[PDB]
Design an enzyme around this catalytic site. Structure first.
Site, PDB file in Angstrom:
ATOM      1  N   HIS A  41     -21.599  43.284  15.492  1.00  0.00           N
ATOM      2  CA  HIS A  41     -21.689  44.132  14.314  1.00  0.00           C
ATOM      3  C   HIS A  41     -22.186  45.536  14.620  1.00  0.00           C
ATOM      4  O   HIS A  41     -22.311  46.342  13.714  1.00  0.00           O
ATOM      5  CB  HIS A  41     -22.495  43.521  13.184  1.00  0.00           C
ATOM      6  CG  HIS A  41     -23.924  43.291  13.458  1.00  0.00           C
ATOM      7  ND1 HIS A  41     -24.399  42.037  13.764  1.00  0.00           N
ATOM      8  CD2 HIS A  41     -24.991  44.083  13.337  1.00  0.00           C
ATOM      9  CE1 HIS A  41     -25.719  42.100  13.879  1.00  0.00           C
ATOM     10  NE2 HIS A  41     -26.105  43.328  13.601  1.00  0.00           N
ATOM     11  N   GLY A 143     -33.617  47.570  14.173  1.00  0.00           N
ATOM     12  CA  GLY A 143     -33.510  47.811  15.604  1.00  0.00           C
ATOM     13  C   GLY A 143     -33.761  46.569  16.471  1.00  0.00           C
ATOM     14  O   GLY A 143     -33.565  46.625  17.677  1.00  0.00           O
ATOM     15  N   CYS A 145     -32.105  43.643  16.381  1.00  0.00           N
ATOM     16  CA  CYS A 145     -30.849  42.980  16.637  1.00  0.00           C
ATOM     17  C   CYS A 145     -30.484  43.136  18.108  1.00  0.00           C
ATOM     18  O   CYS A 145     -30.580  44.228  18.671  1.00  0.00           O
ATOM     19  CB  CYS A 145     -29.741  43.528  15.730  1.00  0.00           C
ATOM     20  SG  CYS A 145     -29.786  42.957  14.008  1.00  0.00           S
TER      21      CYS A 145
HETATM   22  C1  O6K Z   1     -29.600  44.395  12.778  1.00  0.00           C
HETATM   23  O1  O6K Z   1     -28.193  44.591  12.648  1.00  0.00           O
HETATM   24  C2  O6K Z   1     -30.232  45.562  13.516  1.00  0.00           C
HETATM   25  O2  O6K Z   1     -31.300  45.441  14.066  1.00  0.00           O
HETATM   26  N1  O6K Z   1     -29.445  46.688  13.379  1.00  0.00           N
HETATM   27  C3  O6K Z   1     -29.792  48.015  13.870  1.00  0.00           C
HETATM   28  C4  O6K Z   1     -30.419  48.882  12.767  1.00  0.00           C
HETATM   29  C5  O6K Z   1     -30.530  48.355  11.470  1.00  0.00           C
HETATM   30  C6  O6K Z   1     -31.104  49.113  10.468  1.00  0.00           C
HETATM   31  C7  O6K Z   1     -31.566  50.414  10.736  1.00  0.00           C
HETATM   32  C8  O6K Z   1     -31.458  50.941  12.012  1.00  0.00           C
HETATM   33  C9  O6K Z   1     -30.883  50.180  13.021  1.00  0.00           C
HETATM   34  C10 O6K Z   1     -30.544  43.657  11.633  1.00  0.00           C
HETATM   35  C11 O6K Z   1     -32.006  43.131  11.972  1.00  0.00           C
HETATM   36  C12 O6K Z   1     -32.723  42.963  10.603  1.00  0.00           C
HETATM   37  C13 O6K Z   1     -33.259  44.282   9.987  1.00  0.00           C
HETATM   38  C14 O6K Z   1     -34.574  43.910   9.299  1.00  0.00           C
HETATM   39  N2  O6K Z   1     -34.962  42.623   9.866  1.00  0.00           N
HETATM   40  C15 O6K Z   1     -33.940  42.057  10.621  1.00  0.00           C
HETATM   41  O3  O6K Z   1     -34.026  40.956  11.196  1.00  0.00           O
HETATM   42  N3  O6K Z   1     -29.559  42.765  10.996  1.00  0.00           N
HETATM   43  C16 O6K Z   1     -29.062  43.135   9.742  1.00  0.00           C
HETATM   44  O4  O6K Z   1     -29.451  44.158   9.191  1.00  0.00           O
HETATM   45  C17 O6K Z   1     -27.964  42.228   9.138  1.00  0.00           C
HETATM   46  C18 O6K Z   1     -26.586  42.661   9.697  1.00  0.00           C
HETATM   47  C19 O6K Z   1     -25.786  41.540  10.279  1.00  0.00           C
HETATM   48  C20 O6K Z   1     -24.353  41.376   9.819  1.00  0.00           C
HETATM   49  C21 O6K Z   1     -25.376  40.299   9.520  1.00  0.00           C
HETATM   50  N4  O6K Z   1     -28.109  42.300   7.648  1.00  0.00           N
HETATM   51  C22 O6K Z   1     -27.212  43.003   6.837  1.00  0.00           C
HETATM   52  C23 O6K Z   1     -27.373  43.014   5.504  1.00  0.00           C
HETATM   53  C24 O6K Z   1     -28.460  42.346   4.863  1.00  0.00           C
HETATM   54  C25 O6K Z   1     -29.365  41.650   5.642  1.00  0.00           C
HETATM   55  N5  O6K Z   1     -30.505  40.937   5.171  1.00  0.00           N
HETATM   56  C26 O6K Z   1     -30.937  40.827   3.879  1.00  0.00           C
HETATM   57  O5  O6K Z   1     -30.340  41.337   2.907  1.00  0.00           O
HETATM   58  O6  O6K Z   1     -32.044  40.091   3.751  1.00  0.00           O
HETATM   59  C27 O6K Z   1     -33.136  40.421   2.945  1.00  0.00           C
HETATM   60  C28 O6K Z   1     -34.250  39.395   3.186  1.00  0.00           C
HETATM   61  C29 O6K Z   1     -32.703  40.432   1.476  1.00  0.00           C
HETATM   62  C30 O6K Z   1     -33.609  41.852   3.387  1.00  0.00           C
HETATM   63  C31 O6K Z   1     -29.191  41.608   7.073  1.00  0.00           C
HETATM   64  O7  O6K Z   1     -29.972  41.024   7.849  1.00  0.00           O
END
Ligand code: O6K
Ligand code: O6K
EC number: 3.4.19.12
Lengths: 303, 301
Positions: A41, A143, A145
């Site tokens: 992703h 960050g 991920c």
């Molecule tokens: C991940 O992709 C990551 O670290 N991305 C880099 C980045 C993200 C944001 C800003 C700068 C850089 C994250 C890791 C997450 C973030 C917060 N805690 C974590 O464990 N993964 C996601 O954001 C994930 C994307 C992947 C496709 C599935 N995602 C997307 C949309 C929603 C959620 N979660 C969500 O809605 O959960 C609640 C509890 C409602 C916040 C999600 O994890």
């Protein structure tokens, strides 16, 4: 003596972590030999995230679309492929700090160490269990991920987890390193929830043994029970069934202690109905279930 | 986003760990530049454990009596001095994996990571706090002496603990890397025991602020308290006095959450009165005192 939640030493894995950027998205990658592994992703923009077409997204990308940094050094990408929910970026240079390693997939109830990372830099390490509902109870911010979970056996790192997402109750989901999810989750922004969690019965019993081994004994009793009677109360309190294999794996400690598993079961039974109500065992006011039998032995042995 | 007791990445320390043998006795040591640091009681038998004269025991040693090994490489000792309860072996090779490092003495309430080792080889990593009675609650077996505690700040490793002994309650004691003990303990096998322990009040408050940051407010109340009334109550549950310094230190967490330090003191006061009533806070059914304000900020932001 003493009993603690303990991670594997993380140095063998610290040396494999890198930063990966595709456009506005930055997250972490695992660099082994000449391949960087990271979540697929990283190719999604915010817009794509709602309903992504990954094969279509990727076909549009070329090598130049992916910036890979190891420390200050820049790795250049000569190839790219998808496997399930993981992206594999071929690079010019094999990692000199590559350890002996394999990829494995873990069962619910099993534990492993997470190395939390941001921008390719390790920030911290802690132990988790793969829960019966296929989530982990971690600590992960934006960050994170791409961070991985692993075990170590002699000199060989077994990688079992790569981090992808957060769920509504502050718990975490991800894949093995072949990109297959643990649990019924998808890599998309959509309405997802953990199922009802359940307690890992065999791990609680292992921990009651660790409590005994360390001089804590204010829950023991004289009474055996039966699998069937036990399982019936297990069911009532959201505990996994205890199988005959579980009773076998706990054998060492029944021996080491003089206490029958089904004896231990009536102890647990009593704790389940009465409550803990603030009273403690190995420093906890709840029944702990993220230590395996092997974990309890590994730590009262010195390995 | 969750909240866990989290250690530092242990790799920078892993590459400094070696084993030190003297006679029948083997333990761990710490190899930084051309010096290996270990507990001086490596030169004792069991015979000599009650009243060892370390100056007398060391004088009778030659370099060649110390077998030092970093993995399969045998290091050669070329000189030795003693400083307090630590022995410093000079070796003929500088350690190539030596990181940026400093030696600091910590205060009670402060946290750090331990790298538990046996035979020069690391086995696990976990977080600990220096308790107010100058002990730690670790996991240490035969052979673990010489294991070290540390923090990491950027690329700089702060060594703050070296492991020497187990005490009757099953808690642990050691020195800084200049060889001075934390607490009134000594490196000999007389009967000695830890002072009564107390709870680290400032750390518990920091943890409650952490629960609020992570979206959980059930334990708050509508009251406040003076600093002095708070301490008169807390002491009755064996909690450390909270000081004005403590209050200043919780300033940032207060600002982020919009809860005044003394309002959160009132919450704590009530949690001590009531218990949890079946609820939990960040996954715990107890009030947790091994996260510092710096630790909470590190892991939440
Ligand atoms: C991940 O992709 C990551 O670290 N991305 C880099 C980045 C993200 C944001 C800003 C700068 C850089 C994250 C890791 C997450 C973030 C917060 N805690 C974590 O464990 N993964 C996601 O954001 C994930 C994307 C992947 C496709 C599935 N995602 C997307 C949309 C929603 C959620 N979660 C969500 O809605 O959960 C609640 C509890 C409602 C916040 C999600 O994890
Ligand atoms: C430390 O020296 C060590 O690891 N030494 C190497 C070694 C010892 C034994 C067998 C093989 C190799 C140990 C560390 C201890 C052992 C168990 N858990 C620990 O943290 N330190 C001692 O054994 C220590 C040395 C003395 C201070 C200089 N020591 C000696 C004698 C008694 C005790 N404690 C004790 O009586 O234990 C109780 C808890 C009271 C049973 C002690 O720590």
């Amino acid at each position: 003596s003493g009993f603690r939640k303990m991670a594997f030493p993380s140095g063998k894995v610290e040396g494999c972590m890198v930063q990966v950027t595709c456009g506005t998205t930055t997250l972490n990658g695992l660099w082994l030999d000449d391949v960087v592994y990271c979540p697929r992703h990283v190719i999604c923009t915010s817009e794509d995230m709602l309903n992504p077409n990954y094969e279509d997204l990727l076909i549009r990308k070329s090598n130049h679309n992916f910036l890979v940094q190891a420390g200050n050094v820049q790795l250049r990408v000569i190839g790219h492929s998808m496997q399930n929910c993981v992206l594999k970026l071929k690079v010019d240079t094999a990692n000199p700090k590559t350890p002996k390693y394999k990829f494995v997939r873990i069962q619910p109830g099993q534990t492993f160490s997470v190395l939390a990372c941001y921008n390719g830099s390790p920030s911290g390490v802690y132990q988790c269990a793969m829960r019966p509902n296929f989530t982990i109870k971690g600590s992960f911010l934006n960050g994170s991920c791409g961070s991985v979970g692993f075990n170590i056996d002699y000199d060989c790192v077994s990688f079992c987890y790569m981090h992808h997402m957060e769920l509504p109750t502050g718990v975490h989901a991800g894949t093995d390193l072949e990109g297959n999810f643990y649990g019924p989750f998808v890599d998309r922004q959509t309405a997802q929830a953990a199922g009802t969690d359940t307690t890992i019965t065999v791990n609680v019993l292992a921990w009651l043994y660790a409590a005994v081994i360390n001089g804590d004994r204010w829950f023991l009793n004289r009474f055996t029970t039966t699998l069937n009677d036990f399982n019936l109360v297990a069911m009532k309190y959201n505990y996994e069934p205890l199988t005959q294999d579980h009773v076998d794996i706990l054998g060492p400690l029944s021996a080491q202690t003089g206490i029958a598993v089904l004896d231990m079961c009536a102890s647990l039974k009593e704790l389940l109905q009465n409550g803990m109500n603030g009273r403690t065992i190995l420093g906890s006011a709840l029944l702990e279930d993220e230590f395996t039998p092997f974990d309890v032995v590994r730590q009262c042995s010195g390995v």
